[PDB]
Amino acid sequence: DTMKVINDPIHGHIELHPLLVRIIDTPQFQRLRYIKQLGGGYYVFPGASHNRFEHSLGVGYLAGCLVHALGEKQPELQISERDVLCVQIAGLCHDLGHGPFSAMFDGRFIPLARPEVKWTHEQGSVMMFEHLINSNGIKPVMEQYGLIPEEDICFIKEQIVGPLWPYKGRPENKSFLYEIVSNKRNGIDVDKWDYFARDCHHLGIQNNFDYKRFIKFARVCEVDNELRICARDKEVGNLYDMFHTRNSLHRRAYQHKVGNIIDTMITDAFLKADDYIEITGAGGKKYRISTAIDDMEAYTKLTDNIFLEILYSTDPKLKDAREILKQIEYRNLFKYVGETQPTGQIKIKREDYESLPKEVASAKPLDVKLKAEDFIVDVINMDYGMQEKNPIDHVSFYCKTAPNRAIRITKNQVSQLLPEKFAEQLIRVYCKKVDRKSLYAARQYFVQWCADRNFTKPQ
Amino acid sequence: TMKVINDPIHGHIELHPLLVRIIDTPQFQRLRYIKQLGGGYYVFPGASHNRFEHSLGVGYLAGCLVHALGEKQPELQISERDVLCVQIAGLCHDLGHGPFSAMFDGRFIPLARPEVKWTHEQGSVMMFEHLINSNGIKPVMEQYGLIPEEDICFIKEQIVGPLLWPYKGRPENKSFLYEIVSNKRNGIDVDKWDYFARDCHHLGIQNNFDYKRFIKFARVCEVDNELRICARDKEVGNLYDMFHTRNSLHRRAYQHKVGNIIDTMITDAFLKADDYIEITGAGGKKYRISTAIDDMEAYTKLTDNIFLEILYSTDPKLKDAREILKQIEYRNLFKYVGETQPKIKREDYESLPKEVASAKPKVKLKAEDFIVDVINMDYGMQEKNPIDHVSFYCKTAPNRAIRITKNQVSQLLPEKFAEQLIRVYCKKVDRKSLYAARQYFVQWCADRNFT
Amino acid sequence: TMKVINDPIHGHIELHPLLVRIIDTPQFQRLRYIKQLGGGYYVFPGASHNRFEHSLGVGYLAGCLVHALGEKQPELQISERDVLCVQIAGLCHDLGHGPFSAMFDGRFIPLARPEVKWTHEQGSVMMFEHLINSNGIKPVMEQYGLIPEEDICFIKEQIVGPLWPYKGRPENKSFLYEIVSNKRNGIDVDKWDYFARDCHHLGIQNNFDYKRFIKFARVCEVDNELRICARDKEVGNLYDMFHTRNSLHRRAYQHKVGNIIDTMITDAFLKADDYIEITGAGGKKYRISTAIDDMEAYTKLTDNIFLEILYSTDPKLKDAREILKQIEYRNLFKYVGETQPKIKREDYESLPKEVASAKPVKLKAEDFIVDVINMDYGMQEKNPIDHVSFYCKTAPNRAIRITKNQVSQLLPEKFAEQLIRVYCKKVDRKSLYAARQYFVQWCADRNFTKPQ
Amino acid sequence: DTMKVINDPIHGHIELHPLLVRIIDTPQFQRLRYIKQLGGGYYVFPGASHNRFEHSLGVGYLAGCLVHALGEKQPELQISERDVLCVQIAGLCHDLGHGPFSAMFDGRFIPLARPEVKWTHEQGSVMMFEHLINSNGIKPVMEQYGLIPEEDICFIKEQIVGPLLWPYKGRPENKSFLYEIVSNKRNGIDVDKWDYFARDCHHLGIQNNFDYKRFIKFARVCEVDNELRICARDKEVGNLYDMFHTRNSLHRRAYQHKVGNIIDTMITDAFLKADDYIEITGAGGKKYRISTAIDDMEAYTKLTDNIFLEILYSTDPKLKDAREILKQIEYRNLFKYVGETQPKIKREDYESLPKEVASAKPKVLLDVKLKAEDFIVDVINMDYGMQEKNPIDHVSFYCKTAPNRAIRITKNQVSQLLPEKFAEQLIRVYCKKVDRKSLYAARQYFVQWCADRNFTKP
Ligand SMILES: Nc1nc(=O)c2ncn([C@H]3C[C@H](O)[C@@H](CO[P@@](=O)(S)OP(=O)(O)OP(=O)(O)O)O3)c2[nH]1
Ligand SMILES: Nc1nc(=O)c2ncn([C@H]3C[C@H](O)[C@@H](CO[P@@](=O)(S)OP(=O)(O)OP(=O)(O)O)O3)c2[nH]1
Ligand SMILES: Nc1nc(=O)c2ncn([C@H]3C[C@H](O)[C@@H](CO[P@@](=O)(S)OP(=O)(O)OP(=O)(O)O)O3)c2[nH]1
Ligand SMILES: Nc1nc(=O)c2ncn([C@H]3C[C@H](O)[C@@H](CO[P@@](=O)(S)OP(=O)(O)OP(=O)(O)O)O3)c2[nH]1
Ligand SMILES: Nc1nc(=O)c2ncn([C@H]3C[C@H](O)[C@@H](CO[P@@](=O)(S)OP(=O)(O)OP(=O)(O)O)O3)c2[nH]1
Ligand SMILES: Nc1nc(=O)c2ncn([C@H]3C[C@H](O)[C@@H](CO[P@@](=O)(S)OP(=O)(O)OP(=O)(O)O)O3)c2[nH]1
Ligand SMILES: Nc1nc(=O)c2ncn([C@H]3C[C@H](O)[C@@H](CO[P@@](=O)(S)OP(=O)(O)OP(=O)(O)O)O3)c2[nH]1
Ligand SMILES: [Fe+3]
Ligand SMILES: [Fe+3]
Ligand SMILES: [Fe+3]
Ligand SMILES: [Fe+3]
Ligand SMILES: [Mg+2]
Ligand SMILES: [Mg+2]
Ligand SMILES: [Mg+2]
Ligand SMILES: [Mg+2]
Ligand SMILES: [Mg+2]
Ligand SMILES: [Mg+2]
Ligand SMILES: [Mg+2]
16 A cells, blocks of 8 residues: 555645545545535536535645644654644545535525534534544554554544543644644634635636745744644734635625525525435435435435436426426526625624515515515625634734744734724525516615615615 | 626636527536546546536637637628627537546447447537527527528537538638637647646646637638638647647546546446436436437436436445446556557457457456557547648738648657557456456467557 | 737737837837836845836736727727727836836935925826837827827826826716726726736735726716726725735835835935936936936936946945945845834935934934835725726616725725834844834834834 | 745745855855846747746755655655755756856857857856855855865766766765756756746746656656666656657747847847957956956856946947947847758857858849848757757656666657657848848848758748
């Protein structure tokens, strides 16, 4: 068993250790070839055909670069081949839990199909990782290459989903290893760096963030009795620009008005198909689209394929679901009516989403009257990854003249031209009735609703 | 109105409303579910791109080249109608591709149905006919000034060639319109230009060919009482490099040893699934993977999805097909045994595993255990130099077409323009079987005086 | 005929024969010998690009935008003549740059000649006049359908603004004045070329899609004037354009060391100024600081002046040559600190004296550099986007305004700030320590932010 | 003294050890900022403003990557920090000898100005490296960071120019491979090529087909003829034929562009007319000419592309002839291409060719008769870097199944679509008299000359 090399358009030649190859060459990992990174984004940006598989390889590769680089610069950290392998495995496996159309699945479908459960694709990744290990005899292969499976499986999981020192996989003196793949402190992790580059390459938008530079300048210093990753103070401006780029990719691509409408329609189709579709899990037991998340053998076979299974079906019980997807192909989509924003420092909460179409329909501003069933109200939260908080206040820096002393850099020390808030909310309204007289009316309800709630007058 | 689409290769592509109506059909949107490079994606993870994107790009580039000839030479009398027809042909030229693209017409259909002669291009014509007829496109064409009887014929002829001037869609004085999307004279067409750029972008290999430059320098001149596209004489070196790039993309990516083995395995899985899978066509009639090419309503639903349908199946009659695809996920692939060089004709492909298995070198193995992959590497015209079939003009006389021979360009160019490679693989992957398979292979090579 | 030029930023650029005649003059070819980013090249080794390349690119982009407005809206009655004039203005808009570009009009001339008010744009107009008059271009213009009196005025007005305030073109072609140098809001093709080109060469990636902006640009009536309007959808991308510009200033153009190198070159030029002779019209001799008064002399004033000084043996140039030798050895002046308030151009000269008078080795005003850096959105305290007109899909001739609250609550609350950096010319341990003490006391004395 | 980081558009963040910084921050190195990589190419391809300085940093960086990567993959090679520093210094300094407008200077000007001497920019690089060391107190700085200057200076020089039975003194046979990184004498596959392909492409606006990063990942060291050499993975053989293809392709389109070469010829003409009147101050205040400054590195230090502008901006009447030639470049009244043809003609015969053309007696046309001074005859050699030889026959490969056994791969084992020849020669003729009647005549002399020497009808 040797090294394999994989050519990636974002990263070039990626070297994979034989243990990583064994993990990649499983049904649980190869599944990611059949789930698009950007979901309904592909129906607006035709370049965005990229799947989670490619992304996952890239996060494994970048997880490895950052840990290797900290190791070469600071030998006193005593970063081991074992540490490197575990960090790479976590990068490779961090997105195993994604479902059909990625963000659509955990952002839209599961909260509507199963309001009782709290599910994240990250929880899924842990469960799918457990299934992958156990059903492909990976524990002995790990031992062969010097890993200790009890400690290291825990470590890999904790890197994906998170956990007085709360972690068991590695002690405080390797705390920094937990900032690479998924950074809970501030969000600055290699996962972001891969998706910015990859999404850009494919969308046809250009990426402003130099991850290779950030890596060269990263050191480990002591902060609050913990060894953490610190950035060179000089790079502070570039980190505010990293979040700016992320928010900019959300505005243009990920929350595109039509991409979101297509995700909403697919979600609608899935909800109508949910009672009739059967996915075979462990012991031949049958699961639904919404329950396959409870059985990883079933979940393994739940991919973007589900879209085509519904579209190509002839069963009359799937007629409603299939008609929604047929309307996507013909491009008879629901129609955008307008966008607006809360002026209040209080955002609209998930509890209130269901009641919004009713509120719009009750606006008393007309030819055609319209009903709550005719409106979609899409509520979009845009932030810097920590609700109302500035992520950069949670970043540690060093200076050239004292590279072991960690410091904080406040927002006033960087620039007066930076954002005064780090979270905002956008509300888009669409209409399901698409003729001239209905759209005109829908727009009237929308503007009056905006006046009724002291929201921003629309464009 | 117009719609704008952002593409990573071409930037902002403007689509006329008629083109939008054609794109927004099930027959076109189907191309979202067929990978450009098929099994290449299982070697080059960037190659997730599908035929849909490519098809938009050929529509766009077909439009650039025809617009540019029109602006430079108004005397050609290129009409908005001509432009729309050329764009529609670029959009629709790849409608006939099946699951995993080249795999489908290169490997599967010739094995599943040896009696028929099928190309994805014939498929594109049939799928175009189905698309028109089932989406009420003829009246939309008339609305924007096309004449459907003439123009549908013209669009088809652009895709597949004619159906002693052989064409009906357009007369001799617009002959050049037939060289844009699919060039039968020499292969220099916008379809190549899109795939070089797109495949490169995604594979992670860099493209040496500047199509935008070629377009700026393209003119139409009279050659043998026919108006054809000519290249600026200065560009001759760049055209030899275009074919060099194509052949280079075949060596590294398209005929990758493992990419081809994965295509062979998928093909194997399809042959074992063929008798048991049902695809619903017109009037509810059922078709097989290999027969869906006879019914375009069925064919519409035959995409890369078929791979997952087989993989996720529980039916025992699909166990054999499903096990082959499961071995792809585990990466227990068929194993490369060796490569060699003579040409061997398509007529002989089926009989080659038998020939290998009959080698008696100084575990025995059977013909079912060997794959013999015959790979033709050329400049798109068998043994011929495509550039001998290119017309050029000079700066000082831009209407006089000329030929440029190979000795006038460089003594460092290829002496031949076609060669053939034969690879052998084994389906039995253990130590003792591979060793044997290698012995059969070398003795076979000695038996046929190959390298 | 036409010539084609391959550019790494724009691909194949087509040049009409009249534009070739303008390019093939000493006054234009001069721009091959002036670096776009000046002292930036001594920090970012990719930034070897010169103003010539940039100038071709602005000519090309000026042409794309005007051609595209013409194809989309024939009712504008944009003529081949209008197109040629806009292209010529793009080609010639940067003719006035001096040695090391921004250094020359930002730093050297205000110090060498405080009495005069000079911009490279005024220079471009004068150099354009010289180019025309000394290369017999007026009859060549007439040959290809221009009307030189009207059109020369038009080209100049495109570069520098008015000299309805315009004479070269009436109100119904107002929009032609927004292409090369946009006085209303700063959104012009000149920005677009430098973002792309600077990025390509610096090794930083450009976030702004100029080709997209062009596809979406229309002309609509605003206040009885036909202006360029952007598609409403693009408002977010325009805030990001200014964000990108400001980002290129933070990282590259105002790099601490790039600015120190510009300051050192400026210092060398000030010491060489009285001893250099550049031959102008009538054989009259000009200095580096006076060559801006005579375009024949100015023609021969390029980055070459740096090497002339560096390679000299003349004792009168010893002081200037020693400063430039210290740049090669990399014995640069040393950064002491940064701070923030605004300080006006009138006050720049007096600042080293103010620092040296701070009472916290003693040090003197000649020992300090005080570099005042203005970071804004190109209109001082103003939001440029409040001065942009937009159209909607549903009514593409109705122009509208879009306020900042309609776009995003995550946008800047301010559009201008000022940074002050201090450096010391005396580089030993004891001097730097002292220099830092003067600096912090000065900051306390003027109620500036205690330094990082 | 620490590390410095430099951002390069081709290579990204380049790390430079303090010793390398000391070498870079000298007048002898910084000089390369004032010499364009592609010379007269910039007057055809406006993107090609790049100078030798940037290139030189890039070769230092790539020299370092390749040696570091061989070291990480094969610890048994015993590659030292010292070996790495020496290879990097050689990459940084390999182009120190270039003169004004790069190839123009050693290809055209010096062979015409000083036919007696044999000069290459590489000899210059060695001499300039010696001057750089000696005049900037670098020997002690080298010792500070663990180099041994007598051995290591020799090693660095030998890497640049070749040796000065195992011919090398700087390093023994077991580190032979270190000599293949910067300038490969065996086959030409070196990091110097890799930097210029990428950089030239980036700037010219032509796209690069060669993946140097891939080549590096696949490079190993194996034993060949009792010597440890760099070997390529057998699978990469096709990509190496494509590397030479790309080089030859960059020569056809950019480096030997008809007008780029004419501009180099005009600059050379201007330099020859200025050579007697320009004075460059060298060591001890002794004065050198443009053509003699190559004999004194203190003078040579101040000889850059600046010399072009010094001549252009001059007012001295003795420089009027030289200055008028350069003024004609700005106005674009260039010398005019008359024609091209193909046979080889040897360097010994270049000088005599304009005379041969002018002696052609064409069947009695001729308004204007023309003289040898009126013709330029440009002889252009297009090859794979080894005259008539296939460089790939001089490459060693390994297989996956035996990565320590080196092998050869013949051309028939790779492809029947590869070149049958690896060298050809082009002859271009130009005329200095540019009016309609002169060009027509010049073309008549040219075709008769071609008939007289049995060359291809043009
Ligand atoms: N950029 C690039 N150029 C190429 O020429 C090329 N060829 C392949 N690849 C990509 C495809 C893959 O992403 C990666 C590995 O390809 P490889 O062909 S070295 O590997 P194995 O077939 O496994 O050969 P073995 O088993 O004998 O070592 O490089 C390439 N990528
Ligand atoms: N029509 C279409 N087909 C595709 O296959 C496709 N792929 C990407 N895009 C891009 C191009 C489109 O601009 C974008 C959104 O689709 P749209 O325009 S239909 O939907 P709204 O804007 O809500 O409706 P309208 O303009 O009719 O009022 O997606 C596409 N658009
Ligand atoms: N490069 C780029 N930057 C962007 O900011 C951007 N925004 C969208 N796209 C891509 C996505 C598509 O491929 C294309 C069109 O997206 P569009 O937002 S203009 O259009 P419709 O939604 O149809 O809006 P309407 O109906 O009001 O005209 O550009 C973009 N592409
Ligand atoms: N991208 C690119 N590829 C190339 O192969 C190439 N060759 C040249 N150029 C660049 C160099 C220039 O920037 C431009 C045109 O050079 P050109 O060789 S078409 O033309 P003239 O010398 O003018 O030949 P004539 O007088 O017969 O037209 O393209 C090229 N640019
Ligand atoms: N090195 C350097 N220091 C500086 O302080 C500086 N300031 C500008 N530049 C460089 C960066 C660019 O390459 C160029 C910008 O100047 P141009 O004359 S093409 O246009 P404007 O109308 O001045 O710019 P805008 O409208 O955005 O204010 O000069 C600078 N470069
Ligand atoms: N790509 C990129 N992004 C940037 O934001 C950027 N900023 C600078 N550079 C380039 C400029 C140089 O090529 C390189 C390092 O510049 P640096 O600003 S880290 O370094 P010193 O000023 O020497 O500061 P110290 O001594 O305090 O570490 O990166 C940059 N390159
Ligand atoms: N303008 C121009 N004309 C030319 O004839 C020419 N020839 C080379 N160059 C440019 C092209 C490159 O930028 C560089 C090549 O010369 P270098 O000193 S970096 O290395 P070598 O060892 O000579 O190259 P190799 O080993 O491949 O034969 O000079 C040229 N540039
Ligand atoms: Fe991820
Ligand atoms: Fe195609
Ligand atoms: Fe400018
Ligand atoms: Fe070199
Ligand atoms: Mg995730
Ligand atoms: Mg995250
Ligand atoms: Mg096809
Ligand atoms: Mg074809
Ligand atoms: Mg300017
Ligand atoms: Mg401006
Ligand atoms: Mg060299």
